[PDB]
Tab-separated table of all heavy atoms in Angstrom:
chain	number	residue	atom	x	y	z
J	19	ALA	N	-146.170	-74.292	62.519
J	19	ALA	CA	-144.887	-73.405	62.580
J	19	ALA	C	-145.287	-72.128	61.850
J	19	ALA	O	-144.746	-71.157	62.277
J	19	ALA	CB	-143.914	-74.212	61.889
J	20	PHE	N	-146.001	-72.112	60.727
J	20	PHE	CA	-146.223	-70.936	59.907
J	20	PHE	C	-147.563	-70.181	60.255
J	20	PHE	O	-148.606	-70.842	60.220
J	20	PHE	CB	-146.001	-71.247	58.449
J	20	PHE	CG	-145.869	-70.227	57.398
J	20	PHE	CD1	-145.323	-68.985	57.547
J	20	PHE	CD2	-146.502	-70.516	56.157
J	20	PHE	CE1	-145.205	-68.119	56.506
J	20	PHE	CE2	-146.401	-69.596	55.137
J	20	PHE	CZ	-145.810	-68.276	55.343
J	21	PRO	N	-147.643	-68.954	60.710
J	21	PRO	CA	-148.877	-68.264	61.212
J	21	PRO	C	-150.107	-68.224	60.312
J	21	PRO	O	-151.163	-68.378	60.847
J	21	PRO	CB	-148.271	-66.858	61.528
J	21	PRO	CG	-146.920	-67.094	61.903
J	21	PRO	CD	-146.486	-67.918	60.764
J	22	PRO	N	-150.005	-68.044	58.976
J	22	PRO	CA	-151.206	-68.153	58.047
J	22	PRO	C	-151.910	-69.536	57.945
J	22	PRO	O	-152.923	-69.507	57.301
J	22	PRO	CB	-150.511	-67.650	56.650
J	22	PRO	CG	-149.110	-67.953	56.814
J	22	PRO	CD	-148.735	-67.589	58.218
J	23	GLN	N	-151.200	-70.554	58.200
J	23	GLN	CA	-151.752	-71.947	58.065
J	23	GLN	C	-152.959	-72.245	59.030
J	23	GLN	O	-152.935	-71.902	60.167
J	23	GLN	CB	-150.605	-72.984	58.089
J	23	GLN	CG	-149.351	-72.817	57.267
J	23	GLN	CD	-148.404	-73.903	57.324
J	23	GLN	OE1	-147.864	-74.275	58.418
J	23	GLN	NE2	-148.028	-74.445	56.169
J	24	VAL	N	-153.972	-72.892	58.423
J	24	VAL	CA	-155.215	-73.148	59.175
J	24	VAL	C	-155.288	-74.672	59.540
J	24	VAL	O	-154.902	-75.546	58.770
J	24	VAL	CB	-156.461	-72.662	58.471
J	24	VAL	CG1	-157.770	-73.125	59.095
J	24	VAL	CG2	-156.586	-71.161	58.382
J	25	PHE	N	-155.619	-74.960	60.810
J	25	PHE	CA	-155.484	-76.330	61.255
J	25	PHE	C	-156.817	-77.006	61.835
J	25	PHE	O	-157.552	-76.403	62.494
J	25	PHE	CB	-154.240	-76.431	62.305
J	25	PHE	CG	-154.561	-75.932	63.566
J	25	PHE	CD1	-154.457	-76.749	64.768
J	25	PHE	CD2	-154.652	-74.530	63.888
J	25	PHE	CE1	-154.701	-76.190	66.055
J	25	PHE	CE2	-154.880	-74.042	65.132
J	25	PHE	CZ	-154.894	-74.983	66.181
J	26	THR	N	-156.873	-78.406	61.636
J	26	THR	CA	-157.893	-79.243	62.351
J	26	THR	C	-157.450	-79.713	63.667
J	26	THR	O	-156.414	-80.137	63.848
J	26	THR	CB	-158.236	-80.388	61.442
J	26	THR	OG1	-158.610	-79.875	60.178
J	26	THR	CG2	-159.292	-81.296	61.923
J	27	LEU	N	-158.276	-79.543	64.711
J	27	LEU	CA	-157.996	-80.126	66.076
J	27	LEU	C	-158.036	-81.531	66.208
J	27	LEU	O	-158.942	-82.236	65.556
J	27	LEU	CB	-158.901	-79.484	67.129
J	27	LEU	CG	-158.895	-77.947	67.272
J	27	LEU	CD1	-160.057	-77.447	68.152
J	27	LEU	CD2	-157.729	-77.360	67.740
J	28	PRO	N	-157.123	-82.213	66.844
J	28	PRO	CA	-157.170	-83.641	67.158
J	28	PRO	C	-158.300	-84.204	68.039
J	28	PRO	O	-158.739	-83.464	68.916
J	28	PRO	CB	-155.688	-83.805	67.694
J	28	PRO	CG	-155.440	-82.481	68.504
J	28	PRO	CD	-155.953	-81.575	67.433
J	29	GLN	N	-158.751	-85.373	67.784
J	29	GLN	CA	-159.795	-86.002	68.637
J	29	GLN	C	-159.135	-86.668	69.842
J	29	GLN	O	-158.144	-87.442	69.633
J	29	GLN	CB	-160.544	-87.093	67.886
J	29	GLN	CG	-161.696	-87.714	68.664
J	29	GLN	CD	-162.344	-88.831	67.894
J	29	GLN	OE1	-163.409	-89.493	68.137
J	29	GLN	NE2	-161.839	-89.160	66.664
J	30	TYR	N	-159.756	-86.469	71.096
J	30	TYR	CA	-159.342	-87.132	72.279
J	30	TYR	C	-159.697	-88.619	72.476
J	30	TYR	O	-160.776	-89.017	72.111
J	30	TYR	CB	-159.819	-86.198	73.538
J	30	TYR	CG	-159.327	-86.693	74.872
J	30	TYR	CD1	-158.050	-86.541	75.300
J	30	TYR	CD2	-160.217	-87.389	75.687
J	30	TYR	CE1	-157.564	-86.899	76.515
J	30	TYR	CE2	-159.693	-87.832	76.933
J	30	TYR	CZ	-158.475	-87.579	77.369
J	30	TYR	OH	-158.084	-87.943	78.561
J	31	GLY	N	-158.747	-89.381	72.988
J	31	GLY	CA	-158.960	-90.866	73.294
J	31	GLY	C	-157.928	-91.187	74.160
J	31	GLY	O	-157.052	-90.472	74.618
J	32	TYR	N	-158.036	-92.416	74.785
J	32	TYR	CA	-157.068	-93.029	75.746
J	32	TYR	C	-157.113	-94.493	75.798
J	32	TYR	O	-158.016	-95.110	75.365
J	32	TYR	CB	-157.327	-92.400	77.194
J	32	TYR	CG	-158.663	-92.686	77.779
J	32	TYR	CD1	-158.983	-93.890	78.460
J	32	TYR	CD2	-159.674	-91.723	77.635
J	32	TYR	CE1	-160.222	-94.059	78.997
J	32	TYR	CE2	-160.923	-91.955	78.026
J	32	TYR	CZ	-161.249	-93.168	78.824
J	32	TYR	OH	-162.471	-93.308	79.285
J	33	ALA	N	-155.915	-95.110	76.326
J	33	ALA	CA	-155.824	-96.523	76.563
J	33	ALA	C	-155.914	-96.857	78.061
J	33	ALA	O	-155.291	-96.092	78.785
J	33	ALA	CB	-154.707	-97.197	75.838
J	34	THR	N	-156.757	-97.727	78.511
J	34	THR	CA	-156.745	-98.290	79.903
J	34	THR	C	-156.027	-99.554	79.934
J	34	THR	O	-155.158	-99.814	79.216
J	34	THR	CB	-158.124	-98.229	80.680
J	34	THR	OG1	-159.141	-98.302	79.646
J	34	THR	CG2	-158.441	-97.054	81.476
J	35	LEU	N	-156.277	-100.372	80.957
J	35	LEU	CA	-155.818	-101.793	81.159
J	35	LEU	C	-156.320	-102.778	80.141
J	35	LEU	O	-157.543	-102.664	79.835
J	35	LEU	CB	-155.936	-102.108	82.494
J	35	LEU	CG	-155.339	-101.299	83.553
J	35	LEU	CD1	-155.599	-101.688	84.950
J	35	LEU	CD2	-153.822	-101.112	83.343
J	36	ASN	N	-155.578	-103.709	79.724
J	36	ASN	CA	-155.976	-104.788	78.757
J	36	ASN	C	-155.586	-106.134	79.463
J	36	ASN	O	-154.556	-106.144	80.124
J	36	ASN	CB	-155.467	-104.573	77.360
J	36	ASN	CG	-154.085	-104.919	76.967
J	36	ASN	OD1	-153.182	-104.078	77.329
J	36	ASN	ND2	-153.866	-105.883	76.183
J	37	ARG	N	-156.305	-107.306	79.158
J	37	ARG	CA	-155.962	-108.541	79.897
J	37	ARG	C	-155.210	-109.438	79.161
J	37	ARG	O	-155.548	-109.876	78.095
J	37	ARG	CB	-157.392	-109.128	80.416
J	37	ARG	CG	-157.352	-110.506	81.148
J	37	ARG	CD	-158.599	-110.732	81.889
J	37	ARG	NE	-159.795	-110.540	81.053
J	37	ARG	CZ	-160.250	-111.445	80.250
J	37	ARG	NH1	-159.558	-112.515	79.914
J	37	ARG	NH2	-161.432	-111.267	79.577
J	38	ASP	N	-154.058	-110.000	79.699
J	38	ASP	CA	-153.112	-111.019	79.052
J	38	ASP	C	-152.545	-110.714	77.740
J	38	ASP	O	-152.436	-111.714	76.933
J	38	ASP	CB	-153.721	-112.421	79.210
J	38	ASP	CG	-154.195	-112.836	80.574
J	38	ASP	OD1	-153.394	-112.666	81.583
J	38	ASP	OD2	-155.298	-113.280	80.747
J	39	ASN	N	-152.224	-109.488	77.305
J	39	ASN	CA	-151.804	-109.125	75.937
J	39	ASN	C	-152.749	-109.391	74.933
J	39	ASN	O	-152.414	-109.820	73.896
J	39	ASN	CB	-150.291	-109.537	75.867
J	39	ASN	CG	-149.365	-109.148	76.942
J	39	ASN	OD1	-149.142	-108.013	77.230
J	39	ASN	ND2	-148.638	-110.083	77.438
J	40	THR	N	-154.096	-109.100	75.207
J	40	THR	CA	-155.239	-109.305	74.400
J	40	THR	C	-156.109	-108.130	74.283
J	40	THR	O	-155.902	-107.229	75.073
J	40	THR	CB	-155.998	-110.570	74.703
J	40	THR	OG1	-156.744	-110.345	75.874
J	40	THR	CG2	-155.240	-111.895	75.050
J	41	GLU	N	-157.098	-107.952	73.436
J	41	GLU	CA	-158.026	-106.852	73.236
J	41	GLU	C	-159.102	-106.646	74.387
J	41	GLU	O	-159.674	-105.621	74.541
J	41	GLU	CB	-158.853	-107.030	71.917
J	41	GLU	CG	-159.129	-108.422	71.651
J	41	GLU	CD	-160.543	-108.698	71.294
J	41	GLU	OE1	-160.966	-108.147	70.252
J	41	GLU	OE2	-161.311	-109.375	72.021
J	42	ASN	N	-159.250	-107.683	75.229
J	42	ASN	CA	-160.155	-107.687	76.341
J	42	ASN	C	-159.821	-106.782	77.556
J	42	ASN	O	-158.639	-106.704	77.851
J	42	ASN	CB	-160.443	-109.153	76.911
J	42	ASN	CG	-161.238	-109.985	75.852
J	42	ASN	OD1	-162.116	-109.573	75.208
J	42	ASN	ND2	-160.771	-111.186	75.616
J	43	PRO	N	-160.795	-106.254	78.293
J	43	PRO	CA	-160.575	-105.460	79.527
J	43	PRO	C	-160.418	-106.237	80.851
J	43	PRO	O	-160.508	-107.488	80.917
J	43	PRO	CB	-161.816	-104.669	79.581
J	43	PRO	CG	-162.811	-105.550	79.101
J	43	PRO	CD	-162.199	-106.258	77.904
J	44	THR	N	-160.024	-105.598	81.957
J	44	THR	CA	-159.872	-106.114	83.313
J	44	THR	C	-160.866	-105.410	84.237
J	44	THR	O	-161.523	-104.582	83.779
J	44	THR	CB	-158.469	-105.988	83.876
J	44	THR	OG1	-158.216	-104.639	84.251
J	44	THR	CG2	-157.381	-106.286	82.740
J	45	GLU	N	-161.096	-105.986	85.453
J	45	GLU	CA	-161.934	-105.341	86.532
J	45	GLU	C	-161.299	-103.991	86.962
J	45	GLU	O	-162.153	-103.154	87.379
J	45	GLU	CB	-162.106	-106.206	87.763
J	45	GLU	CG	-161.976	-107.780	87.359
J	45	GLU	CD	-161.799	-108.541	88.585
J	45	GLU	OE1	-162.217	-108.052	89.716
J	45	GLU	OE2	-161.223	-109.616	88.568
J	46	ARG	N	-160.052	-103.874	87.018
J	46	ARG	CA	-159.241	-102.497	87.225
J	46	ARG	C	-159.375	-101.447	86.130
J	46	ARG	O	-159.258	-100.337	86.420
J	46	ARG	CB	-157.913	-102.990	87.663
J	46	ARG	CG	-157.682	-103.377	89.127
J	46	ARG	CD	-156.329	-103.017	89.618
J	46	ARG	NE	-155.548	-104.136	89.815
J	46	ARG	CZ	-155.658	-104.855	91.033
J	46	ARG	NH1	-156.262	-104.422	91.929
J	46	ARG	NH2	-154.978	-106.039	90.960
J	47	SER	N	-159.864	-101.832	84.851
J	47	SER	CA	-159.968	-100.979	83.591
J	47	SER	C	-161.003	-99.973	83.955
J	47	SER	O	-162.202	-100.280	84.465
J	47	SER	CB	-160.146	-101.840	82.480
J	47	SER	OG	-161.135	-101.256	81.602
J	48	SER	N	-160.751	-98.745	83.544
J	48	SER	CA	-161.585	-97.498	83.907
J	48	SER	C	-162.181	-96.668	82.707
J	48	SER	O	-161.587	-96.642	81.717
J	48	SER	CB	-160.694	-96.452	84.746
J	48	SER	OG	-160.131	-96.996	85.888
J	49	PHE	N	-163.435	-96.227	82.984
J	49	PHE	CA	-164.116	-95.427	81.982
J	49	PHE	C	-164.236	-94.025	82.537
J	49	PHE	O	-164.455	-93.785	83.716
J	49	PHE	CB	-165.524	-95.943	81.518
J	49	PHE	CG	-166.229	-94.970	80.797
J	49	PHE	CD1	-165.800	-94.544	79.397
J	49	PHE	CD2	-167.346	-94.274	81.317
J	49	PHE	CE1	-166.607	-93.631	78.696
J	49	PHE	CE2	-168.058	-93.288	80.597
J	49	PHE	CZ	-167.709	-93.018	79.266
J	50	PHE	N	-163.913	-93.020	81.715
J	50	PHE	CA	-164.028	-91.538	82.135
J	50	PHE	C	-165.012	-90.825	81.222
J	50	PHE	O	-164.820	-90.906	79.974
J	50	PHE	CB	-162.693	-90.838	82.101
J	50	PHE	CG	-161.592	-91.498	83.085
J	50	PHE	CD1	-160.678	-92.433	82.574
J	50	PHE	CD2	-161.396	-91.066	84.310
J	50	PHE	CE1	-159.737	-92.956	83.339
J	50	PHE	CE2	-160.428	-91.565	85.113
J	50	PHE	CZ	-159.575	-92.548	84.627
J	51	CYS	N	-165.957	-90.095	81.748
J	51	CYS	CA	-166.929	-89.189	81.024
J	51	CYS	C	-166.530	-87.757	81.229
J	51	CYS	O	-166.453	-87.234	82.251
J	51	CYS	CB	-168.372	-89.458	81.593
J	51	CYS	SG	-169.736	-88.648	80.666
J	52	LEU	N	-166.431	-87.023	80.018
J	52	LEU	CA	-165.952	-85.498	79.958
J	52	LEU	C	-167.051	-84.668	80.391
J	52	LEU	O	-166.918	-83.642	81.018
J	52	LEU	CB	-165.365	-85.284	78.624
J	52	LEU	CG	-164.128	-85.993	78.178
J	52	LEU	CD1	-163.143	-84.934	77.499
J	52	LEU	CD2	-163.304	-86.697	79.388
J	53	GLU	N	-168.390	-85.077	80.099
J	53	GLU	CA	-169.672	-84.296	80.432
J	53	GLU	C	-169.839	-84.371	81.995
J	53	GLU	O	-170.712	-83.494	82.446
J	53	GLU	CB	-170.762	-84.979	79.603
J	53	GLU	CG	-170.620	-84.527	78.095
J	53	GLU	CD	-169.973	-85.477	77.270
J	53	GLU	OE1	-169.088	-86.330	77.785
J	53	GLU	OE2	-170.044	-85.409	76.063
J	54	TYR	N	-169.286	-85.221	82.752
J	54	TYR	CA	-169.314	-85.232	84.237
J	54	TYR	C	-168.580	-84.000	84.813
J	54	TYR	O	-168.948	-83.578	85.882
J	54	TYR	CB	-168.942	-86.594	84.827
J	54	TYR	CG	-169.322	-86.735	86.274
J	54	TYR	CD1	-170.628	-86.243	86.736
J	54	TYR	CD2	-168.642	-87.546	87.175
J	54	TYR	CE1	-170.985	-86.373	88.026
J	54	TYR	CE2	-168.986	-87.689	88.448
J	54	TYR	CZ	-170.248	-87.199	88.947
J	54	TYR	OH	-170.652	-87.393	90.186
J	55	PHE	N	-167.475	-83.460	84.175
J	55	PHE	CA	-166.868	-82.203	84.618
J	55	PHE	C	-167.729	-81.004	84.147
J	55	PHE	O	-168.555	-81.109	83.313
J	55	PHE	CB	-165.501	-82.054	83.851
J	55	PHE	CG	-164.381	-83.043	84.176
J	55	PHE	CD1	-164.388	-84.416	83.606
J	55	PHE	CD2	-163.388	-82.720	85.133
J	55	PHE	CE1	-163.355	-85.228	84.025
J	55	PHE	CE2	-162.378	-83.553	85.418
J	55	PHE	CZ	-162.445	-84.941	84.926
J	56	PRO	N	-167.639	-79.957	85.009
J	56	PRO	CA	-168.289	-78.575	84.561
J	56	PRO	C	-167.583	-77.825	83.283
J	56	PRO	O	-166.371	-77.820	83.257
J	56	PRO	CB	-168.242	-77.672	85.865
J	56	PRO	CG	-167.226	-78.366	86.757
J	56	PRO	CD	-167.154	-79.729	86.247
J	57	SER	N	-168.318	-77.288	82.407
J	57	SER	CA	-167.795	-76.587	81.247
J	57	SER	C	-168.384	-75.226	80.849
J	57	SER	O	-169.728	-75.152	81.221
J	57	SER	CB	-167.656	-77.400	79.930
J	57	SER	OG	-168.945	-77.985	79.514
J	58	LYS	N	-167.710	-74.157	80.308
J	58	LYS	CA	-168.255	-73.010	79.887
J	58	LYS	C	-169.075	-73.227	78.465
J	58	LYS	O	-168.547	-73.852	77.679
J	58	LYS	CB	-167.247	-71.918	79.740
J	58	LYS	CG	-167.386	-70.741	80.686
J	58	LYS	CD	-166.815	-71.050	82.114
J	58	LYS	CE	-167.616	-70.641	83.247
J	58	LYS	NZ	-166.779	-70.418	84.401
J	59	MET	N	-170.244	-72.550	78.378
J	59	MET	CA	-170.950	-72.657	77.030
J	59	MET	C	-170.886	-71.301	76.259
J	59	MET	O	-171.021	-70.263	76.817
J	59	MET	CB	-172.384	-73.067	77.289
J	59	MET	CG	-172.487	-74.610	77.707
J	59	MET	SD	-174.129	-75.227	77.995
J	59	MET	CE	-174.412	-76.218	76.549
J	60	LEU	N	-170.573	-71.301	75.078
J	60	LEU	CA	-170.350	-70.148	74.160
J	60	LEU	C	-171.098	-69.996	72.921
J	60	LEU	O	-171.044	-70.993	72.162
J	60	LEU	CB	-168.796	-69.866	73.853
J	60	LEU	CG	-167.734	-70.031	74.994
J	60	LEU	CD1	-166.339	-69.999	74.389
J	60	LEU	CD2	-167.821	-68.981	76.101
J	61	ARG	N	-171.746	-68.830	72.874
J	61	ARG	CA	-172.380	-68.451	71.493
J	61	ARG	C	-171.408	-67.687	70.734
J	61	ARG	O	-170.267	-67.578	71.111
J	61	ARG	CB	-173.818	-67.953	71.739
J	61	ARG	CG	-174.874	-68.976	71.866
J	61	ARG	CD	-176.366	-68.437	71.718
J	61	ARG	NE	-177.392	-68.932	72.571
J	61	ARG	CZ	-178.588	-68.930	72.389
J	61	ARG	NH1	-179.213	-67.880	71.837
J	61	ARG	NH2	-179.410	-70.093	72.701
């Protein structure tokens, strides 16, 4: 809200499918890689 304040960026994460209200995954559950997309490189 205040222009002079300096801030830390949040880390990216996500939830996919879970099996029977437990911590385990399902066959439908998905993994996504960010490095698979194209990105600009900056010095």
Side-chain angles (χ1 to χ4, degrees):
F20 190 40
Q23 308 185 304
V24 167
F25 75 113
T26 305
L27 304 164
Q29 183 189 186
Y30 186 75
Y32 58 88
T34 25
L35 299 179
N36 78 283
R37 182 159 50 74
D38 309 310
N39 312 297
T40 74
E41 37 131 64
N42 297 314
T44 76
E45 335 160 26
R46 275 211 252 276
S47 140
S48 301
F49 170 71
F50 302 92
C51 187
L52 302 215
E53 284 94 340
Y54 200 35
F55 295 81
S57 62
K58 248 85 224 205
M59 290 181 104
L60 312 171
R61 275 198 216 204

